Design a binder for this molecule. Structure first.
Ligand SMILES: Cc1cc2nc3c(=O)[nH]c(=O)nc-3n(C[C@H](O)[C@H](O)[C@H](O)COP(=O)(O)OP(=O)(O)OC[C@H]3O[C@@H](n4cnc5c(N)ncnc54)[C@H](O)[C@@H]3O)c2cc1C
Ligand SMILES: NC(=O)c1ccc[n+]([C@@H]2O[C@H](COP(=O)([O-])OP(=O)(O)OC[C@H]3O[C@@H](n4cnc5c(N)ncnc54)[C@H](O)[C@@H]3O)[C@@H](O)[C@H]2O)c1
Ligand SMILES: O=c1[nH]c(=O)c2[nH]c(=O)[nH]c2[nH]1
Ligand code: FES
Ligand code: FES
Lengths: 1304, 49, 98, 49
């Protein structure tokens, strides 16, 4: 047969021409119109596409449920299963408990990740109605959220856990009734009693055979060895989508019983090759629980690796055989299988052989010793014998759902009753183009006793045997080498301990108790969270929601997948798709463009280039950018043109058929390249006050150094997206856009087309995150799409793939700082000079304003009487960097805290004392001469220092550090001051429009866009207070250029302040009009006044407007106020680092934040947590790598590791400062979005403190004032913990050789 | 009347909060909005004509 | 608009009220989310009622631009507007008539 | 209005009207209507929210 038959939310799907290249995500969204399931990445790392699968499992004879990534599931793999999406469990008319609790608990901000998380939690409950807290956190290893900081999601879902004023009331949550879940489709139960037959599906390019028997598979492989096996598709799906590989014949063997079997033998347990690792996990778990420890050493090694192997979605379908045969250099399983000599059975038609995985199984890059006609039948994972001990190790950038930098399996067998080595196996991934064994090191240790000599021998051996070429793919050469030795050391100590428990302590010696912590397997305590905020006055009306924790107005819809993001909008029948074509060279002339192959692709329409632009090819905020490249390309990712086709698949294929010929031009990549070539955006920016000569001469001490700060990708879960709809009259076009900046979108489209602004309407309902990334860079997609629409007279759509988005749209600016600070022995700072350099990329964009804000914040919280800062924006051949939440403040302030950290250390005084005594006081002027009024920072400081018990905790940290050699704790408390208002004064304006209809209902709109920050919620709260009517009677539907014109971007944390005032004024106008009707009927309801006004011919429509007064700073004269007011806050963070791996735990963070009189404490705490965790990523996890030729390597969640559920502080306390009204903003509130982000520096400096402890421990000589650049990743942490292992691994960088990456 | 264009409505549900957009050949946007909203049981503010 | 040239007339009106060419003013559509609570286009009176409304919205804009006009009485319309925008003056107004 | 492109998921509606000046509706039978390809539903008074 060849009909594909499955169910979606209980409805039968019969697909008569299934294409093997069609994913479930595309089928759900585009064929069935079910858009709750989202595209976040296409590579299995984000879980935005999570859905549940149910089937009758013929082997286990029962209905099963598991979660999958719809982005990677071929529909041709899904015959006779039942899919459930977020739409299948509930809706706003009847929410599933999972949906209700995530919404009500403030676990949904932008909402784009909410369906995926819902479905992960839903699946867990279908399998385990009473989960543990740990099982709950585990459900989300494969789900990312960029907004919430994760805390509220777990806190809300904790209510389901067996082992379990306020922000929400769990008592009001409706109970779970599992009898009310959807029926398993009866038809599938009926069909369970028919033999499976072989199915054949034929697509445009690919044939898929679903094989029903081993015979059919082996026959097919004999006659057509080329047939590509696909089981989980979690590798093949990547090869196809990301490496443009096409396998025209696929065979899926997943149904074949022999490949799914589990057989318990005397030597171990044999798994069919198509068994998912979820099944391996559950089988080995049970085996480990019930068998003696002595026999389960290897089982436990596998389980250890599976803990940190992707997430539930991947492990449900990823097969053990698939991992083996993929033969990735960074397989986490193959090192373990190899170290344990696991037994593989191979078959073909009429052949059977068994081998032991050893070095020869993996000859070359991604090859095995399988014959082309052979498949893997099974793998026997062995029992461990008496005197046989096993460890598995993995170190990545992040613990959960990450790819190994180094991964290892290690095994030793002792001659019985001895401590003498019979067998030793040390195998590694991430050290070669294949899984390798340390074959030259290992035989020399046979017959040796397990002692210090063996340890030293093996480490010397490993360092020589496991060489890495400076150019080795992945870089981090010193760190990787250090890890092999560090892992062996842990294994060494672990085996000492295991010998000990075998009553051989006398022979090998006991472990020094300060070493014990080195061998502990990762465990993280259950979270403990606190949220403190202020109650509104007892007098306040229950209908006045200002200052109440009202949930985000769209939360329920977001949980239900009913909330509409741009790409969820239904396509017009005549709608076309656009694909951008981008430069693969940093700087080159375009020699020629060949569209010949592109034109052959079915549905191809046209290829747009600069010549197709009707009016102006000059775009971007400072008019220095092209719409499409003309003559030269100036970065890898520079947009050359755009393919238009009928479908995205056809646009992508056609785009690959656009062949471009280049002639290279001198490229300027790095900040240094730029300094040397004098290549800058404009002149030096400078702020200077006092007398720098005097200060330095007066200083008891002077310290100099540099700091590098890496950039940041926004990773909004919803990428850039525009639909442009041409209207066919007078140049009129409507655009639906995921953008924070309707005005610039409108202007840039209009100018490109040569039509007036009044012809172009830009509409934004909501964004799945923006964070500054959509303040300007959204327009590079909008203009392209607009042009396509104009040219064709048809609607056109483009949503960027994650790799596209990350390459084109740029990021936070990398900064290089050179500082010199003068200070007294008391720690008082008397002089400071800082030169800042930023890498701006290939257009100006907001770079100069970002440098200004960095300079405005180079003081952080500290009064410095003699000071000078400069900034220079480098112009390079990289994508243009832009706004990212903080907008230069975080970079400015980290530099300040970095030299501040060195002041404290140089004085030998406690850092908190040194910070406090340098802190501004009320009435002080900043370095830019603005007076600090309502200066709450000292209150924030005292509350935080007291509630976090900082001093008692110091004592515990010191004690931990004296008692542990290979783990260290650190503790730091950091303040912040953040100036509120755009650096460009006139952007401090906003507008609103309000209508009251004759039913009394109010339709409000304003210039701000919703991107998950709860702006609309706040404006509804504001309008409800202002009009004195319930929030229920007021609605905001969208933001549009044709309702409120000339709007500033939703940026600079300002949007509630500006739009709140606009809304308030609009509301005051309406009230002025209704006054005479109020007076005549003072108790008669709102509806009666309104109808009376209407029948009296009184306008019920008003605009409102606000401009922030008294703003305007001059750099010439160092006078005028850039800011309306300042935000203040403090965080105290504690960490524990692994000195051997560079991993760390965030043990605890306490934040006190001044948000004035919060408009909405639930939203504001969410913004604090979200912002903090984005800073946590910036300073400790998130790292972009570029080739020496300026090509971004880092283009997806696989390599770009944002914070995960398991990243956040275990103990996470947030207090909003009490009793601090801010007169000069709407209802005495303060802006919140950006200021908290820098407070995650507390984790950075806590790490820095722990590293200092580690260096005192094992250093010798160690440079005091050691370097720690940002981000402080496992690499940087581990490399800085110098010891007997790093010492044996260091040296190289032979001159100016080629290397994988360059620091930009 | 024999307007050469007969009566015609397109109604586009937005799937959020009862929101609906209507493209109508009508001289009376207000009564269109009112009558649609009353029939559905939603406020005027959800209905755009 | 039903063929009576009402938008044509309102543009003509706005162009006189604002003292700019009709080419610089556009009407795209009628919509309940831009002007609420509207009477039907009926009783022959739609140019009378909407023309006064348009006129009043135009007068508000003029009043807001007159400081910029005084400072540059020759400099073009475009300069007054941009000047108003960068001084953070609202360039949106309702108008109404009974 | 009708010149606006259709959405790929757009449906069509047709009114069913009385063939009598004044009568009780005794019954409605939609059994032949349900046989038409592409038929979705027949709305009546009972469908009004
Ligand atoms: C988000 C994400 C995270 C990941 N994390 C990790 C990780 O932490 N560690 C890690 O090691 N891997 C990781 N992977 C890689 C991948 O998940 C695994 O390698 C998985 O085991 C592949 O199995 P599959 O069944 O999906 O293989 P498929 O993609 O279906 O097949 C992969 C290869 O195996 C072949 N094949 C499959 N079965 C057989 C057989 N019986 N005989 C012969 N050939 C066969 C196929 O032809 C193909 O060449 C990750 C992948 C993703 C998408
Ligand atoms: O699967 P996938 O795409 O995630 O991985 P991949 O096949 O793209 O390989 C990437 C990783 O494999 C390792 N690797 C590959 N070649 C190597 C070499 N010559 N020397 C040392 N290490 C090497 C590195 O750790 C590298 O970071
Ligand atoms: O002063 C600022 N101006 C901006 O344009 C902007 N954008 C942003 O994210 N933060 C800031 N801050
Ligand atoms: S879209 Fe499927 S995992 Fe990200
Ligand atoms: S709320 Fe999770 S990505 Fe936005």
């Amino acid at each position: 047969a060849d009909e594909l038959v499955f169910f979606v939310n209980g409805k039968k799907v019969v697909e008569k021409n299934a294409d093997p290249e069609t994913t479930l995500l595309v089928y759900l969204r585009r064929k069935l119109g079910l858009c709750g399931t989202k595209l976040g990445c296409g590579e299995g790392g984000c879980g935005a596409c999570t859905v549940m699968i149910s089937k009758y499992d013929r082997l286990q004879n029962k209905i099963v449920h598991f979660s999958v990534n719809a982005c990677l599931a071929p529909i041709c793999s899904l015959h006779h299963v039942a899919v459930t999406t977020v739409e299948g469990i509930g809706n706003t008319q009847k929410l599933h408990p999972v949906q209700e609790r995530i919404a009500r608990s403030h676990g949904s901000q932008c909402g784009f990740c909410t369906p995926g998380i819902v479905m992960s939690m839903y699946t867990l409950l279908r399998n385990q109605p009473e989960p543990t807290v740990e099982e709950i956190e585990n459900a989300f290893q494969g789900n990312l959220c960029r907004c919430t900081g994760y805390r509220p999601i777990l806190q809300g879902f904790r209510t389901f856990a067996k082992d379990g004023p306020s922000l929400f009331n769990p008592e009001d949550f409706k109970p779970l009734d599992p009898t009310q879940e959807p029926i398993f489709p009866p038809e599938l139960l009926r069909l369970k009693d028919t033999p499976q037959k072989k199915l054949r599906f034929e697509g445009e390019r690919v044939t898929w055979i679903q094989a029903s028997t081993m015979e059919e598979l082996l026959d097919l492989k004999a006659q057509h060895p080329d047939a590509k096996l696909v089981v989980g598709n979690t590798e093949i799906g990547i090869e196809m989508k990301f490496k443009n590989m096409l396998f025209p014949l696929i065979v899926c063997p997943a149904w074949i019983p022999e490949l799914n079997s589990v057989v318990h033998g005397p030597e171990g347990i044999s798994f069919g090759a198509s068994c998912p690792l979820s099944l391996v996990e559950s089988v080995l778990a049970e085996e480990i629980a019930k068998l003696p420890e002595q026999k389960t050493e290897v089982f436990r090694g596998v389980m250890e690796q599976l803990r940190w192997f992707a997430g539930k979605q991947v492990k449900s379908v990823a097969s053990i055989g698939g991992n083996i045969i993929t033969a990735s250099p960074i397989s986490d399983l193959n090192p373990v299988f190899m170290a344990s000599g696991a037994k593989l059975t191979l078959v073909s038609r009429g052949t059977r052989r068994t081998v032991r995985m050893d070095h020869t199984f993996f000859p070359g890059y991604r090859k095995t010793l399988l014959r082309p006609e052979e498949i893997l039948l099974s793998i026997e994972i062995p029992y461990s014998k008496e005197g046989e001990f096993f460890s598995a190790f993995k170190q990545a950038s992040r613990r959960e759902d990450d790819i190994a930098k180094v991964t290892s399996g290690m095994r030793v067998l002792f001659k019985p009753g001895t401590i003498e080595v019979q067998e030793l196996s040390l195998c590694f991934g991430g050290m070669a183009d294949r899984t390798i064994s340390a074959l030259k090191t290992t035989p020399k240790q046979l017959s040796k006793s397990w002692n210090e000599e063996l340890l030293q021998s093996v480490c010397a051996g490993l360092a020589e045997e496991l060489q890495l070429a400076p150019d080795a793919p992945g870089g981090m050469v010193e760190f990787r080498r250090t890890l092999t030795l560090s892992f062996f050391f842990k294994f060494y100590l672990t085996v000492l301990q295991k010998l000990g428990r075998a009553d051989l302590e006398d022979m090998c010696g006991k472990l020094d108790p300060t070493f014990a912590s080195a061998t502990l397997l990762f465990q993280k305590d259950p979270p403990a969270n606190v949220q403190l905020f202020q109650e509104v006055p007892k007098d306040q009306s229950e209908e006045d929601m200002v200052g109440r924790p009202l949930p985000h107005l769209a939360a329920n819809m977001q949980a239900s997948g009913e909330a509409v993001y741009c790409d969820d909008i239904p396509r017009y029948e005549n709608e076309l798709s656009l694909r951008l074509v981008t430069s693969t060279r940093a700087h080159a002339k375009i020699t020629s463009i060949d569209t010949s192959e592109a034109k052959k692709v079915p549905g191809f329409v046209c290829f747009l280039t600069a010549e197709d632009v009707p009016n102006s090819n000059a775009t971007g905020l400072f008019n220095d950018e092209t719409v499409f490249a003309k003559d030269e390309v100036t970065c890898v990712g520079h947009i050359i043109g755009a393919v238009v086709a009928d479908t995205p698949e056809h646009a992508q294929r056609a785009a690959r058929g656009v062949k471009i010929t280049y002639e290279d031009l001198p490229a300027i990549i790095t900040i240094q390249d730029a300094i040397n070539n004098n290549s800058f955006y404009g002149s030096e920016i400078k702020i200077e006050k006092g007398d720098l000569k005097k200060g330095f001469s007066e200083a008891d001490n002077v310290v100099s150094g540099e700091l590098y700060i890496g950039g940041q990708e926004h990773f909004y879960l919803e990428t850039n997206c525009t639909i442009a709809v041409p209207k066919g009259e007078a140049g009129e076009m409507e655009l639906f856009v995921s953008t924070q900046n309707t005005m610039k979108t409108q202007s840039f489209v209009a100018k490109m087309l040569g039509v007036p602004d009044n012809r172009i309407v830009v509409r934004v309902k909501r964004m799945g995150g923006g964070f500054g990334g959509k303040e300007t860079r959204s327009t590079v997609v909008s203009t392209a799409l607009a042009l396509a629409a104009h040219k064709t007279g048809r609607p056109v759509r483009c949503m960027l793939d994650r790799d596209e988005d990350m390459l084109i749209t740029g990021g936070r600016h990398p900064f290089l700082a050179k500082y010199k600070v003068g200070f007294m022995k008391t720690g008082t700072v008397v002089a400071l000079e800082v030169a800042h350099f930023s890498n701006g990329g290939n257009t100006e964009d907001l770079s100069r304003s970002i440098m200004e804000r960095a300079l405005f914040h180079m003081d952080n919280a500290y009064k410095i009487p003699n000071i000078r800062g400069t900034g220079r924006i480098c112009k390079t051949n990289l994508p243009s960097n832009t706004a990212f939440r903080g907008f230069g403040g975080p970079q400015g302030m980290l530099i300040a805290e970095y030299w501040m950290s060195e002041v404290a250390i140089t004085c030998g005084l406690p850092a908190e004392e040194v910070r406090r005594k340098n802190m501004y006081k009320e009435g002080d002027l900043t370095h830019f001469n603005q007076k600090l009024e309502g200066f709450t920072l000292p209150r924030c400081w005292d509350e935080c220092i007291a509630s976090s018990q900082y001093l008692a905790r110091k004592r515990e940290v010191e004690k931990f550090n004296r008692e542990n050699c290979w783990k260290k704790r650190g503790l730091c408390i950091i303040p912040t001051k953040f100036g509120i208002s755009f650096t460009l004064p006139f952007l401090n304006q906003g507008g609103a429009l309000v209508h009251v209809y004759t039913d009394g209902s109010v339709l409000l709109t304003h210039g701000g866009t919703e991107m998950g920050q709860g702006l609309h919620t706040k404006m509804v709260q504001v309008a409800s207070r202002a009009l004195k009517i319930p929030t229920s009677k007021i609605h905001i539907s969208e933001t549009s250029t044709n309702t409120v014109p000339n709007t500033s971007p939703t940026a600079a944390s300002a949007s509630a302040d500006l739009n709140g005032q606009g809304v308030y004024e609009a509301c005051q106008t309406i009230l002025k009009r209704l006054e005479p009707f109020k007076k005549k009927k003072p108790t008669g309801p709102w509806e009666a006044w309104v109808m009376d006004a209407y029948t009296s011919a009184v306008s019920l429509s008003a605009t409102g407007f606000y401009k922030t007064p008294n703003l305007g700073y001059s750099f010439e004269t160092n006078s005028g106020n850039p800011f309306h007011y300042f935000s203040y806050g403090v965080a105290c963070s504690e960490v524990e680092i692994d000195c051997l791996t560079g991993d760390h735990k965030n043990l605890r963070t306490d934040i006190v934040m001044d948000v004035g009189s919060s408009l909405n404490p639930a939203i504001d705490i969410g913004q604090v947590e979200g912002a903090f965790v984005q800073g946590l990523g910036l300073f400790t996890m998130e790292e972009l790598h570029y080739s020496p030729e300026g090509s971004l390597h880092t283009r997806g969640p696989s390599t770009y590791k944002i914070p995960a559920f398991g990243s956040i502080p275990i103990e996470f306390r947030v207090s909003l400062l009490r009793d601090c009204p801010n007169k000069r903003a709407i209802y005495a509130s303060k802006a919140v979005g950006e200021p908290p982000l820098f407070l995650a520096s507390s984790i950075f400096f806590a790490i820095k403190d722990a590293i200092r402890a580690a260096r005192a421990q094992h250093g010798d000589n160690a440079k005091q004032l050691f370097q720690l650049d940002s981000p402080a990743t496992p690499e940087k942490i581990r490399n800085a913990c110098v010891d007997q292992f790093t010492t044996l691994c260091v040296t190289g960088v032979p001159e100016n050789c080629k290397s994988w990456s360059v620091r930009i």
